[PDB]
Symmetry: C2
Subunit: 335 residues, 2 copies
């Protein structure tokens, strides 16, 4: 093309959009801020940031321990918790890198070689995982106890990452099902296209209206298995290139076989027929698998990054500035 | 105009037949070890009957890690089979299970000769009869390639390349001078601070130090875990802290899960201690490891942008020299 493409991080922008606490020039999320920030770009009520005192912020996470420390951990806390920005970037990386185990970072912080780390290492773990004094916090209390006594064992960290993936799945399901125990395929499409603001949506929504019939729905199990699929989009993309090279079109049983090989799972016909019908951009019986792959990528990244290439513009600006300030001295000494 | 991989193939391919060019197994081994032929291989023209007798070497070669060496020149390897083997070498963790399971139409763990080129082309993206076709599917395509046999081939191939490189740099012996290990390590690195590396080799090493085949293999294994090693170094880099010898050995052990000898690691440290502190210049070291892994056959992101910008500078000088002529 005409430029290198830098992936620009909107993670801090998202954090500032959803954080509802401030204390001493530092902003913080409640667990609820965190869940909605990973699901949405914009906040529903621009409510003004609560400015808290040392005692107040201590009280926010005080009366906890009530939370079920499995996959309803964050939901159960409501607003009763505190999450720092570096902890946020850590949590974002766990969601957008679901297959990563970060064993190298853990072991590098496991100085005693016991498969455990100490509270002092937690922020280092956060900063390495998410590269591309201090008040007490919900994660600090959970992993390292109330006054920093216990240590985070690796298998506990693995379980926490698993419960976090699950909890985002189930909370996204509750938002798009309007709590109501099944998800209309209209709403599943809404979810699927959420981070795809590229204008092409006319055909997707006309497809949704015409092709799938009123009353059809999916369950939480179908939704979870599709999220799993989405985390295997790179395997799916290999299977798609093996059709792109043979110049062959992807029909419905070919789509289903590719999906089986990507996930190792048997997704339901109810799900995969709907997905096919939606991304059958033309009237043919063929998957427009390119734009589908694009949409799975949008879905996986959650609006947290934006590609750009204004490197050439800065280059030109610097060329013109330097050449001008060089002529301003080369010729004002000449004639 | 040719790609790096096609350029290497044309550099080392010694057989011609029907206007196509083929490698023997020996050509392939030296293809991945070196960038320039020494004698300029005489290209032997072939006709139908010739390549059959060439193929006949498969009757007698073992199928473990001495496969390619046993054949010597008695074999035929095509260009797409070459990109396939390259990719197995330069992406040694990949597994390729997805491509296999997609070509395995009958649900079993096996593919037919008809799928083999598909497998090559997919694995390598970013009916003349050949040694590999005969090895995998039989002389007449009468058998099929199980995934396990394929995986174990990939392992044997990595092992053979390690053992052959060791022989080339040990000059046939069961020990490799540390100077020659350094020659191998820097072999796909251009000339940057090359003189510092070599001054270090000369001054920091005592005469007659060597490494075993085991040590060389442990270092090749380490080289395949360079991204794990990179994470370990970036932790130090974010702590604004230097990598001394003990931290080097701990990083290597954690990136490898294996115990590399002090004999090897102290030499590696001393070589890449560019500034003469007792701290490891680990940015330049990690660059060399990537060099080594890619064998000069792949371009990489950073070099792609740094060439895009040299093209931009070229066209910009052309642009000012044009627009100047637009006045007089």
């Amino acid at each position: 093309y005409l430029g290198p493409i830098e992936k620009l991080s909107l993670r801090k922008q998202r954090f500032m959009q959803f954080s509802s606490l401030e204390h001493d020039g530092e902003y913080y999320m409640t667990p609820r801020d965190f869940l909605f920030s990973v699901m949405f770009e914009q906040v529903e009520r621009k409510t003004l940031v609560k400015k808290l005192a040392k005692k107040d912020i201590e009280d926010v996470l005080s009366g906890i321990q009530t939370a079920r420390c499995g996959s309803t951990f964050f939901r159960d806390l409501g607003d009763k918790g505190v999450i720092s920005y570096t902890e946020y970037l850590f949590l974002l990386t766990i969601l957008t890198k679901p297959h990563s185990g970060f064993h190298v970072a853990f072991k590098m912080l496991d100085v005693d070689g016991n498969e455990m780390i100490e509270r002092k290492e937690f922020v280092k773990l956060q900063k390495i995982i998410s590269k591309q004094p201090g008040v007490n916090t919900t994660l600090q209390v959970r992993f390292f106890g109330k006054r920093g006594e216990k240590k985070l064992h690796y298998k506990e960290f693995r379980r926490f990452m698993e419960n976090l993936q699950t909890e985002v799945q189930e909370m996204e399901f509750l938002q798009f099902s309007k709590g109501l125990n099944f998800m209309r395929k209209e709403d599943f499409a809404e979810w699927l296209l959420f981070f795809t603001n590229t204008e092409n949506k006319d055909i997707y929504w006309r497809n949704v209206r015409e092709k799938l019939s009123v009353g059809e729905s999916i369950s939480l199990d179908e939704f979870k298995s599709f999220c799993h699929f989405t985390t295997h989009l790179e395997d799916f993309a290999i299977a798609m290139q093996m059709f792109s090279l043979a110049h062959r079109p992807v029909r419905l049983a070919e789509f289903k076989r590719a999906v089986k090989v990507a996930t190792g799972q048997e997704l339901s016909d109810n799900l995969l027929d709907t997905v096919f019908k939606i991304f059958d951009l033309d009237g043919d019986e063929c998957l427009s698998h390119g734009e589908f792959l694009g949409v799975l990528k949008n879905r996986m990244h959650r609006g947290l990054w934006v590609s750009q290439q204004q490197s050439v513009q800065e280059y030109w600006k610097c060329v013109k500035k330097e050449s001008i300030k060089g002529v301003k001295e080369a010729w004002r000494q000449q004639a």
